[PDB]
Every structure is written in structure tokens, then in C-alpha cells.
Design an enzyme around this catalytic site. Structure first.
Site, PDB file in Angstrom:
ATOM      1  N   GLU A  18      22.528 -42.124  -9.891  1.00 51.70           N
ATOM      2  CA  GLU A  18      23.131 -42.392  -8.581  1.00 51.70           C
ATOM      3  C   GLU A  18      22.544 -41.533  -7.436  1.00 51.70           C
ATOM      4  O   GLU A  18      22.244 -40.352  -7.650  1.00 51.70           O
ATOM      5  CB  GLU A  18      24.658 -42.229  -8.641  1.00 51.70           C
ATOM      6  N   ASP A 117       5.013 -43.654 -13.812  1.00 53.86           N
ATOM      7  CA  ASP A 117       6.032 -44.670 -13.585  1.00 53.86           C
ATOM      8  C   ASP A 117       6.030 -45.229 -12.115  1.00 53.86           C
ATOM      9  O   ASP A 117       7.074 -45.345 -11.468  1.00 53.86           O
ATOM     10  CB  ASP A 117       7.390 -44.137 -14.111  1.00 53.86           C
ATOM     11  CG  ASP A 117       8.630 -44.985 -13.905  1.00 53.86           C
ATOM     12  OD1 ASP A 117       8.579 -46.206 -14.239  1.00 53.86           O
ATOM     13  OD2 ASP A 117       9.684 -44.413 -13.452  1.00 53.86           O
ATOM     14  N   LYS A 119       6.145 -47.969  -9.416  1.00 49.43           N
ATOM     15  CA  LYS A 119       6.664 -49.334  -9.266  1.00 49.43           C
ATOM     16  C   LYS A 119       7.329 -49.521  -7.906  1.00 49.43           C
ATOM     17  O   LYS A 119       7.717 -48.531  -7.305  1.00 49.43           O
ATOM     18  CB  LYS A 119       7.562 -49.751 -10.446  1.00 49.43           C
ATOM     19  CG  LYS A 119       8.711 -48.840 -10.742  1.00 49.43           C
ATOM     20  CD  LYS A 119       9.014 -48.862 -12.200  1.00 49.43           C
ATOM     21  CE  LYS A 119      10.390 -48.301 -12.471  1.00 49.43           C
ATOM     22  NZ  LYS A 119      10.611 -48.082 -13.931  1.00 49.43           N
ATOM     23  N   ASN A 122      10.094 -47.140  -6.843  1.00 42.88           N
ATOM     24  CA  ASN A 122       9.781 -45.710  -6.769  1.00 42.88           C
ATOM     25  C   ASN A 122       9.020 -45.406  -5.489  1.00 42.88           C
ATOM     26  O   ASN A 122       8.616 -44.276  -5.265  1.00 42.88           O
ATOM     27  CB  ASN A 122       9.050 -45.228  -8.029  1.00 42.88           C
ATOM     28  CG  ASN A 122       9.915 -45.239  -9.273  1.00 42.88           C
ATOM     29  OD1 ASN A 122      11.145 -45.030  -9.250  1.00 42.88           O
ATOM     30  ND2 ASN A 122       9.286 -45.473 -10.398  1.00 42.88           N
ATOM     31  N   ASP A 138      10.471 -40.427  -8.030  1.00 42.82           N
ATOM     32  CA  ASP A 138      10.711 -40.522  -9.465  1.00 42.82           C
ATOM     33  C   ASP A 138       9.596 -39.888 -10.297  1.00 42.82           C
ATOM     34  O   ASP A 138       8.859 -40.567 -11.027  1.00 42.82           O
ATOM     35  CB  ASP A 138      11.058 -41.974  -9.859  1.00 42.82           C
ATOM     36  CG  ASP A 138      11.875 -42.198 -11.128  1.00 42.82           C
ATOM     37  OD1 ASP A 138      11.889 -41.284 -12.010  1.00 42.82           O
ATOM     38  OD2 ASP A 138      12.454 -43.312 -11.275  1.00 42.82           O
ATOM     39  N   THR A 156     -16.348 -25.654 -34.871  1.00 40.16           N
ATOM     40  CA  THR A 156     -17.221 -26.519 -35.663  1.00 40.16           C
ATOM     41  C   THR A 156     -16.341 -27.574 -36.357  1.00 40.16           C
ATOM     42  O   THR A 156     -15.400 -27.211 -37.080  1.00 40.16           O
ATOM     43  CB  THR A 156     -18.118 -25.682 -36.603  1.00 40.16           C
ATOM     44  OG1 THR A 156     -18.848 -24.735 -35.816  1.00 40.16           O
ATOM     45  CG2 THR A 156     -19.102 -26.529 -37.406  1.00 40.16           C
TER      46      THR A 156
END
Ligand code: Z2M
Ligand code: Z2M
Lengths: 282, 282
Positions: A18, A117, A119, A122, A138, A156
């Protein structure tokens, strides 16, 4: 109820998502308070260190019964709300927003941060105006960049498993995942529809993505320039190694637009008018 | 000089390798103190939690100008010292040691720990006797196992990059790297020579490993059973998915040896004689 400490500095108000609008008591200015009910340590660690006009800024943080994060308020809400239900964004508005997303993502990458993330939900718009500043949010899923592969390679490989040696070829291209996301965001903004979906298709979502065969509807894209479409094609490349970087994208013909680069600088200086300390005049 | 706190509990003595023999003041018993000059947090976090007869045990730790780690003393030194300069280990002695390495590695894997750096120099022998208990050390490079891929997969891959979806097929087989190492350790013990080397070869070390084409010298392996060689072949598999696990290995014909399984139980109970609290007799 909200904790005493938060109540002491801020006056809590109406919900935003929220996420709730609050008022800083000292300033009487509006702020946004993201409540993340009980990794937030890493998100703040990143955000406190980060400083760019297109990345969200932390103002304060509260670690109580829940996590309370104080951010600058974005009056235009999410970029997602501008593209929902085949709402197509004007090409200029796409250029302006994309340009900022590129600068923002480039900066992350410069500083060794992979968003992971990216999108429309965001990306936040600063004002209710279509010519405005955007901001990336975000950082929950974000990763930081020395590889334990590099520490291994100093030795090695007598006992090293083959797959570790094979992983070397691919290594150091994790950041390409954000360029894919921008490519998907740019497709969404320009067309109004997503490149990969389970709507009116037989082919699995995994399969469309792995094959890189995006759903192209010509009638929709006729309204969109070849320059814009070319850039999408260059970011929506299956091979991360071949896939365009933010620097490659920022150099692309589509973004060599002096009016857009001007509008953003104008939006930038307008935001910075209140912050401006007098200048050391030569 | 050594810190006051360490000096207060232990009497420092002759070097072992830096690793130094010390004496616990309370008990007058010998201990080993590994000095790791200024990730050690993770190594202790693992070792304090871990509890198996074939994994090294922490007794104490000191965080001063350097890191001081108090471990049970291993009188037989490294397994590496037993295989140096084409010193070939007796097949029975191989079975006994390998069996323990499998149990130890299986346990790590059970508890979500990947050793990542298994080599003869990280295997310690308890006594100067060839029939003795072995112990796994050097949890420096070890990894712990929820994947951020799993957190990603819960969402709709609309914006997910193809490579992330491709990584799904391979995912959850990181532990196979330890089975490769055991396979390389087992080759070394049995033959006296390593499976992959730059000695008298044109082919790159990377290439031998990636191809999985180990250097097989028949005259050397004539002294070794087909059962032993089969197990090596099963662990030295390029595809981690096809590659044998510790459980698969422990089920192998070569390890279905009742005398070896008996000798180890006998060595185990002999170590546990001093620790034994009286039993609740029915
Ligand atoms: C979640 C993560 O950041 C936010 C957020 C941060 C700063 N200003 C804002 N205005 N509106 C929102 C939300 C309602 C879209 C936000 C929400
Ligand atoms: C490094 C990491 O662990 C050790 C170690 C731990 C416990 N007992 C031991 N005996 N001898 C050695 C070293 C000399 C081989 C060790 C050294």
C-alpha cells in the site's frame, strides 16, 4: 495504527494505491509513504546511494511493525494507467518517456545496479501533464554487481566443473534483462498492446518469449514510425549478447531528436527552480 | 602478536601449514588454529550450524586484527600430501576415503550447502594411519540455497527476458559441481595422476574439461577395478543433469562393500569412545 515516530514528522492522508499520501509537518509539503508490511534493507541501501532525476528518491524510512518508506510524491501516478486497455501513447510522449527510462537504466547499470523488474507499473509520472518527468521505482528485485566466477577463474581449473567454464561465455550480461524490459515497455507504449500474450494465441507465453516472435499487428503499427519499430526490434533480441544496450539505444536514430532532448532539459530545470542555490558568477 | 582473548584460552605452538597447533588451557588438548588475515562470517555461520563426523567442527572463533578459527586437530594432514608426485593410493584406502567424502558432501547438499572448492588439499586425515577418518574443510567458497528465479516465476513473464526462462531448464543443479570435484578427486586417488592437465598435451585445460575427455593411461588403470573406473566415468559427465549425484554414487556397485562400511563404523565408534555419555538401558 501508524508508529509514533512517523506520526511525529508526517500527517497521514488519503491512499494512492500500500502507498499513502502524507504531509511533512516541517514543510507542509506532500510526500508519498509506501507501507511494505512484514530485503527492504537492500532496496533502501540502493535508493539512498542512488541520485538521478529519473530515479525515485528516499526522503525518510521507518522500521516499526511494518516498513514505512518516505518518497517524493508523483502527481501523475503510474505509466501503466496511461497504457491500460489499448490506450495508445502519442509517439512524441513515447520518445520523451523512453529517453528518460534509458538515461535512468543506463545510470543504474553505470553504478552496478540491475533493476530486474522494469514494467509500466514501476514507472511514475511527475505531473498530470503528458510532457512531464518520469521516475523509476520498485528496487525490490534489484541486484548489485565482484562475481564469484571471477574469484574461481584466478585458480587452476583442475577440479572445476565444465558448466562453470561454459558459464564464462555468457557471464557479465545480466544487465541485458533490463533492456529486454525496456523493449517490452516501448512496444506497449507505441502500440497499446503487449508483444507477448496468451490472448488469441495457441503458442505458450514461454515459447513466444524464448523464440522472440512478438505479435505484430500491422494496422496498429502503421501509425508508428520505422525508426521506433527498428529500436523495438533491436531491444527485443533473444541473444543478450546481440541485444542493444542503453548506450546503443541512446545512440539510435529514433532518439536523435533535439526537440525531445530540449523538452526534457526544460522539464528538468523547471523541477530544479526551487532547489537552486545562487551561482558563483565569473 | 596474538590477541589477549585467544592467548587467554589457548597456548600457541608450531605451525601446521596460515594454520598453527595450539593447546586449549582448560583441557591441555591439542587444537588447530587457522589464521585468516584481513566472508569468514559466512564460513563460521555454516560451520557452527553443520554437524557430521566427516565435516570439520569449529570449537571457537576470534575476530581481532585478523580472523582466528579454532578447529579439531587433524593428525594426518591433507589428503593432497598422500597423492603428490604420482603417489598412488591403495584401492581400499580410496573406497574408505571416497565413501566418507560422499557421506560428507551428501550431508552438505541435504542441508542446502554447496562446497564449491572440493580438492585433495581440503580433505584432512584424522590420523597418520591409512585406515582413518577424513574431514572436509575450507568452506570459504561455499554457497547456501530460495532462488530469485522462483520469486520471478510466480509472476506473468510478459516483461521477462528469454534467457531467464531458458535458465529454468538448467536451474537447481549447482550442487552437481561438487560431484564433478569428487570425480576429479577419485581419479587422482586411484591413478596417482589428474584427469585434466596442461602436461604433455596440446589441447587447452578449458577444452579438455568442456569436452569431458579425460587423459586415460591404460597401464596405470590396469591396477584399478572396472567398478572404480565406472564410478569415475559416471561422475566425470559433462551434463550436470546426467551427472551422478552423491545418492546415486553411494548406491553404486563400487561402494556396496561391507568391510569398508564396517571399518568406517569401527573408526567412528573409536572416535566417539571419549564423548560417550551412559546409555538409558531398557
Ligand atoms: C509504490 C512505489 O512507489 C510509489 C510512489 C512513489 C512516489 N510517488 C508516488 N505517487 N504515486 C505513487 C503510486 C500510486 C502510484 C507513488 C508507489
Ligand atoms: C586449513 C584449514 O583447516 C586446517 C586444519 C584444520 C584442522 N586440523 C588440521 N590439521 N592440519 C591442518 C592443516 C595442515 C593441514 C588442519 C588447515
Amino acid at each position: 495504527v501508524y508508529p509514533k515516530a512517523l506520526r511525529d514528522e508526517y500527517i497521514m492522508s488519503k491512499t494512492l494505491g500500500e502507498v499513502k499520501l502524507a504531509f511533512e509537518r516541517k514543510t507542509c509539503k506532500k510526500v508519498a509513504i509506501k507501507i511494505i508490511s512484514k530485503n527492504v534493507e537492500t532496496e533502501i541501501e540502493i535508493l539512498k546511494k542512488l541520485n538521478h532525476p529519473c530515479i525515485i528518491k528516499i526522503k525518510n524510512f521507518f522500521d516499526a511493525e511494518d516498513y514505512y518508506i518516505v518518497l517524493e510524491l508523483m502527481e501523475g501516478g503510474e505509466l501503466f494507467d496511461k497504457v491500460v486497455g489499448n490506450k495508445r501513447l502519442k509517439e512524441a510522449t513515447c520518445k520523451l518517456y523512453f529517453y528518460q527510462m534509458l538515461l535512468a537504466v543506463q545510470y543504474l547499470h553505470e553504478n552496478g545496479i540491475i533493476h530486474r523488474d522494469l514494467k509500466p507499473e514501476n514507472v511514475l509520472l511527475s505531473s498530470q501533464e503528458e510532457d512531464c518527468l518520469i521516475k523509476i521505482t520498485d528496487f525490490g528485485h534489484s541486484k548489485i554487481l565482484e562475481t564469484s566466477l571471477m574469484r574461481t577463474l584466478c585458480g587452476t581449473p583442475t577440479y572445476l566443473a565444465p558448466e562453470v567454464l561454459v558459464s564464462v561465455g555468457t557471464a557479465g550480461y545480466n544487465r541485458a534483462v533490463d533492456c529486454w524490459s525496456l523493449g517490452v515497455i516501448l512496444f506497449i507504449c507505441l502500440s497499446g498492446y503487449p508483444p507477448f500474450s496468451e490472448h488469441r494465441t495457441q503458442v505458450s507465453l514461454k515459447d513466444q518469449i524464448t523464440s522472440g516472435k512478438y505479435n505484430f499487428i500491422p494496422e496498429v503499427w502503421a501509425e508508428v514510425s520505422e525508426k521506433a519499430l527498428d529500436l523495438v526490434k533491436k531491444l527485443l533480441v533473444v541473444d543478450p549478447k546481440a541485444r542493444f544496450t542503453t548506450e546503443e539505444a541512446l545512440r539510435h536514430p529514433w532518439l536523435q531528436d533535439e526537440d525531445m532532448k530540449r523538452k526534457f532539459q526544460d522539464l528538468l530545470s523547471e523541477e530544479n527552480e526551487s532547489t537552486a542555490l545562487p551561482q558563483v558568477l565569473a
